[PDB]
């Protein structure tokens, strides 16, 4: 905040929602509670400048958890491979993938 | 150009009134067949 009163008078107005790893109704965890738990206690009171370099290899692991960016890239590459030999007809899926 | 009105009130625009003209008849069931009522009304009040 610019003029921090939430800390001063000691009453929470918006901190409860600011993150997805905070306490949720009936303990419904977020999708990436494990990552946001680790990321938050990684760069806490260490410094915003002293955060983007050291709490990095843990941060993108979280940013991947939200968006599955390179994970979906993996599926696209695999599915792209399927199209390029199924038409060529070298391989057939095992019955596990049919029934 | 023209300086703005020094009292800061623009000259009132010319009337743009567009009251409806309606003929309540001579076919309306409440017109009782032969009543040609041309009424000037704005919205729903005559």
């Amino acid at each position: 905040p610019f003029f921090d009163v939430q800390k001063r008078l000691g009453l929470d107005l918006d901190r409860w929602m600011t993150i997805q790893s905070a306490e949720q109704p009936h303990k419904i965890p977020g999708r990436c509670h494990a990552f946001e738990k680790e990321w938050i206690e990684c760069a806490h009171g260490i410094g915003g400048i002293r955060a983007e370099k050291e709490c990095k290899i843990e941060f993108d692991d979280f940013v991947e958890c939200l968006l599955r960016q390179k994970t979906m890239k993996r599926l696209s590459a695999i599915k792209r491979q399927r199209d390029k030999l199924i038409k060529e007809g070298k391989y057939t899926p095992p019955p596990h993938h049919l029934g | 150009w023209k300086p703005p009105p020094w009292n800061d009130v623009d000259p009132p625009k010319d009337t743009l009134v567009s009251n409806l003209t309606l003929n309540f008849g001579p076919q309306h069931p409440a017109a009782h067949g032969v009543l040609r009522l041309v009424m000037e009304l704005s919205g729903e009040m005559v």
Binding site: P1, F3, D4, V5, K7, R8, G45, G47, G48 | -
Partner: protein
């Protein structure tokens, strides 16, 4: 800089450790100028309301100077405190980080060679 200083308490005019600093003197020239500033507000107020600019509303002038002096005195306490705080982590960082701050063995002018520019 220092809104991110550890232990910093927002919405607190003067923190506790500020009191360890020498309080500004009453006859501090910057403080008395702030009082002189309060005086100047007195003349203008009489001037805007077209009253006797030197003898009217002496009660108004008395309030117009005391209020400036008070807010002045507290402001200078904060003024000294921040400069002292800036000088504090100043010398904390120099001692905790010797390597990045070289103390060159500076040597007198008899050993240096500064070119002389013949002016004419």
């Amino acid at each position: 800089m220092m809104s991110g200083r550890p232990g910093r308490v927002p919405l607190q005019f003067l923190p506790n450790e500020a009191r360890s600093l020498p309080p500004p003197k009453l006859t501090d020239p910057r403080l008395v100028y702030m009082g002189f500033l309060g005086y100047c507000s007195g003349l203008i107020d009489n001037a805007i309301r077209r009253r006797p600019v030197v003898s009217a509303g002496l009660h108004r002038q008395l309030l117009y100077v005391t209020s400036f002096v008070f807010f002045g005195y507290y402001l200078l306490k904060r003024q000294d405190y921040m400069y002292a705080l800036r000088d504090h982590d100043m010398f904390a960082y120099v001692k905790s980080h010797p390597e990045d701050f070289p103390e060159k063995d500076k040597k007198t002018y008899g050993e240096i060679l500064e070119e002389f520019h013949p002016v004419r």
